[PDB]
Paper text:
Gram-positive pili differ from those of Gram-negative bacteria by the presence of covalently linked subunits containing a conserved LPXTG motif or a variant of it. In S. pneumoniae, the genes coding for the pilus are contained in a 12 Kb pathogenicity island (the rlrA islet), consisting of seven genes of which rrgA, rrgB, and rrgC encode LPXTG-containing proteins. Only RrgB is strictly necessary for the pilus formation while the other two are ancillary proteins. Here the crystal structure of the RrgBD2–D4 backbone subunit fitted into the EM reconstruction of the S. pneumoniae pilus reveals for the first time the polymeric architecture of a Gram-positive pilus indicating a head-to-tail organization of individual backbone subunits.
The fragment of RrgB designated RrgBD2-D4 (residues 184–627) was crystallized in three different crystal forms (in space groups P212121, P6122 and C2221). All the three forms of RrgBD2–D4 possess identical tertiary structure and all exhibited root mean square deviations (rmsds) with each other on aligned carbon alpha atoms of less than 7 Å. Each RrgBD2–D4 crystal form contained one molecule in the asymmetric unit, consisting of an elongated polypeptide (84 Å in length, 50 Å in width) made of three immunoglobulin-like domains (named D2, D3 and D4). The first 262 residues (184–446) form a dual domain (D2 and D3) made of two β-sandwiches of approximately 100 residues present in all crystal forms. The C-terminal 180 residues (446–627) form a third domain (D4) that contains an additional anti-parallel α-helical motif. All three domains D2, D3 and D4 are structurally homologous to each other, consisting of a pair of four-stranded β-sheets forming a β-sandwich configuration. We also find that each of the three crystallized domains of RrgB contains intra-molecular isopeptide bonds involving: Asn 318-Lys193 for D2; Asn 428-Lys349 for D3, and Asn 623-Lys453 for D4. The C-terminal immunoglobulin domain (D4) of the crystal structure matched well into the smaller globular density present below the groove with the core of seven β-strands placed internally the filament and the additional anti-parallel α-helical motif exposed on the surface. The fitting confirmed that pilus volume (∼155×e3 Å3) and dimensions (52 Å in width and 252 Å in length) could accommodate two RrgBD2–D4 molecules organized in a head-to-tail arrangement with rotations ranging between 17° and 22° along the vertical axis of the lower RrgBD2–D4 subunit in respect to the upper one.
Author numbering: 186 to 627
Write the structure that this text describes.
Amino acid sequence: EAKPKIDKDFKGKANPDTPRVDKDTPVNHQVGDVVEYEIVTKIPALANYATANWSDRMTEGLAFNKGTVKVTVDDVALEAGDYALTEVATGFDLKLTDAGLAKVNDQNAEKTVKITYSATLNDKAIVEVPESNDVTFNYGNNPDHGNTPKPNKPNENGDLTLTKTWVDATGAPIPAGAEATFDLVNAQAGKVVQTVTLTTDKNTVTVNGLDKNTEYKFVERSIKGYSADYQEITTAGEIAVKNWKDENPKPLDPTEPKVVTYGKKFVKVNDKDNRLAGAEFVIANADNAGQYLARKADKVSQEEKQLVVTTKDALDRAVAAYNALTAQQQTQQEKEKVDKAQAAYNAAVIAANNAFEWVADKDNENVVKLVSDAQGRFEITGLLAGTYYLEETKQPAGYALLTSRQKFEVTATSYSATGQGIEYTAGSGKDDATKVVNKKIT
């Protein structure tokens, strides 16, 4: 029996015979980039499959673009009746009907199926944390109920629990068929985190001490004659798998491409390194003149546009009140009011920054505006690597306005690296931000 072959990659790069070996190197994209993917499957001559299904799911920072799936066989588009497509927020399932199966079965030569589609890197992607998809091709001469893992976060305790059930080909409950081993995998970066095994007398296992902001997946090692149906995620910290006794070959599971966004942290200080609240900046693409970084209007929701306005107004008020205090009056508790308002603002900006463009006039509501908190902190996330320039548009109370822009470089580690000259948060032991120095004489 010749086996089918599969690969998944960016558009034009998939190759089932010779898959890329450096796929674990993420490609830098910015929030709003539409990323195009390609799944190529080779089916041997004289196949007689009862099921040929593809299941694709992705981590939460990639939004599957509904309506973008195209599927061809030997470069001929399938007809609507040839497949059933179901689309969910995190991906899709594409299942050949009998009309579609007829196009890949009983053929006198290898058939090439190509599925293309895109996803948009979204406002939930975290700087330097990659986003990935995961695909299975589930097939066999009997009907197959297998599909691809659904990544999930642990619960707030850092716990993730696997539960397995077993059914026969008809979906009727049956006793555990065999020991079942799974690799717990970091779904963002594709690294194995642990291996667990369920013995036949105990169908649950909990993994502890996981990162609550990381998505993971339990990937079942093939059990002879059983196919793995990963159930829809309903709650953090829980993953469920149903093993169907379909008596089919193990599914195909290609290696997965990765994308990642970059970022930069800053701290507003004076020449004595005192941290300063309420400095406002925009981002330009040159040291003079040039353009300013803005979110694209047609990609910010009504709710998002209003939250930026609301939170900016609360921040302006919180900064004005903090500024009316004497230095001795600027206590931990007073700084906290500013930091809370700034954090709500920063979160609204990150939510509203769904795509970027460069504009001529900095006097534009969509131009990204950064504001320093009472520890002087401000940051930008979701970016392409490159060279950028901060322009101060409003100095901290009592200082002169800066007369030059400040160049900074965004890189694969510009957000996280130490050695940058100041701690983003005082006392952290990591100097992972760049100082922006204000003066009374410019």
